[PDB]
Design a protein around this ligand. Structure first.
Ligand SMILES: Nc1ncnc2c1ncn2[C@@H]1O[C@H](COP(=O)(O)OP(=O)(O)OP(=O)(O)O)[C@@H](O)[C@H]1O
Ligand SMILES: Nc1ncnc2c1ncn2[C@@H]1O[C@H](COP(=O)(O)OP(=O)(O)OP(=O)(O)O)[C@@H](O)[C@H]1O
Lengths: 243, 246
């Protein structure tokens, strides 16, 4: 459904060499949504674009702030005060002019989550920090079998080598992930499996949290983003191989 | 000491909250050199800037090519055909206008390495791909006790969770590192000591290589950038430890 141009092949030849032609087409035909374009999600957006994903949706309504500078790819002096999602969309268009980027200038809420998630995404990357919306987002994708990867807390951590993906039920050292399980259970009835799983893939770190509200670093928060994207692409490729 | 301005505190207050106030100033006073502004070094540079490093030198003479798009932070439509180091420098100035950024529009060679490393860097991040000059750079820094972190090959890899740090003698699934060791031996007589170590810290991955599909190894942002990020984290950690020891 995207006809790969010669220019696209120039941009993404390295992607073809790594994942294969079938994968290159799969990515070019994919539509991935990132919700929250902050210290995790902005790097996830970047990585999507640089891996030949053919359509990307970004959901956020916040502006670039100078305090974002330590950990968000869109935080540059001339961007300050502009909407994070539009700034990122403009950058994606510079990475891959043929990528179809949509900006939703809104916050996902429990009342609008169904209408936004129901578009038909290949994958959803959840990089929101507010717990009530995040729980609602995860609950919705999970019930509807919308492929999702969610991300735990990326602040207060210095070691990018401790980042990994596991079922949301098995995360450790992560109070955000913990409070999410709580909310899922009580407000959406989401609960453990036969196997002790919630069936929700989560990027988290095993690192014990560093208290000074938390600080953050690019090397860690970006790696959350990148690990979420690589997890998604792996799943998508495994699915495409199966059928 | 570099004076930390109120604007600096606005940009990097998150850094101070994570690493502490002493570290904020250590980073502001630091001068770190990145050699090779590509799949790994471009993201190393980005990360140094966003962590409040006060001086950064960038060494490369290559230009931004459209084929860099899959894995280099400076590869955008408008930059194609410009010098990588200059493009990256301009971006660092947008991240932190008070960072002092030096561009060396050249390649490191066995004949210029001493002059370029004679500067007194806090740290050197070696992200070059060419094995002969890579050996020359590493051998120079090692002999001179210049703090350095190198990396092996970042291509042919899809899993950013397998990246970690070991001594250069101990890397696996990394033809580049292997050649590098051969060249260190053959050209600088640098060889393993009694404990099996070269005394060179190297970012590598345990991942089995993914060979060319569809003309050398491919690469992805998610992995090559994480190489650079793990290099920066390692360097900052070592710098903080040496400061505390002192
Ligand atoms: N319900 C929501 N829908 C979409 N995006 C959201 C929602 N809630 C939060 N976000 C966004 O998620 C991102 C979270 O990013 P991150 O945690 O790094 O921190 P930030 O909010 O930019 O920083 P700070 O904590 O300093 O305000 C932000 O860009 C934020 O605007
Ligand atoms: N002797 C050297 N000194 C400084 N930089 C170097 C040296 N040799 C190579 N480099 C730089 O190291 C970086 C390596 O990056 P990377 O391996 O991603 O390759 P690239 O050269 O942009 O890719 P390709 O040439 O395969 O398209 C490049 O920007 C390159 O110009």
């Amino acid at each position: 459904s995207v006809v790969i141009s010669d220019a696209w092949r120039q941009r993404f030849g390295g992607t073809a060499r790594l994942y294969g032609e079938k994968a290159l087409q799969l990515f070019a035909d994919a539509h991935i949504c990132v919700v929250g374009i902050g210290g995790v999600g902005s790097w996830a957006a970047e990585a999507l674009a640089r891996t030949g994903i053919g359509a990307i949706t970004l959901i956020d309504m916040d502006d670039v702030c100078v305090t974002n500078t330590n950990r968000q790819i869109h935080a540059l002096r001339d961007n300050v005060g502009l909407a994070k999602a539009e700034v990122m969309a403009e950058r994606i268009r510079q990475i891959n002019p043929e990528c179809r980027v949509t900006v939703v200038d809104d916050f996902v809420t429990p009342d609008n989550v169904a209408q936004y998630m129901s578009v038909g995404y290949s994958y959803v990357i959840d990089a929101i920090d507010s717990v009530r919306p995040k729980a609602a987002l995860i609950a919705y994708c999970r019930r509807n079998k919308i492929p999702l990867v969610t991300t735990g807390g990326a602040g207060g951590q210095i070691d990018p080598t401790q980042i990994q993906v596991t079922d949301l039920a098995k995360t450790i050292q992560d109070p955000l992930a913990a409070k999410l399980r709580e909310r899922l259970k009580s407000d959406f009835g989401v609960v453990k499996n036969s196997k002790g799983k919630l069936g929700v893939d989560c990027v988290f770190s095993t690192e014990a949290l560093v208290y000074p509200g938390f600080g953050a670093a690019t090397m860690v928060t970006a790696t959350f983003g990148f690990v979420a994207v690589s997890h998604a692409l792996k799943k998508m490729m495994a699915k495409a191989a199966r059928q």
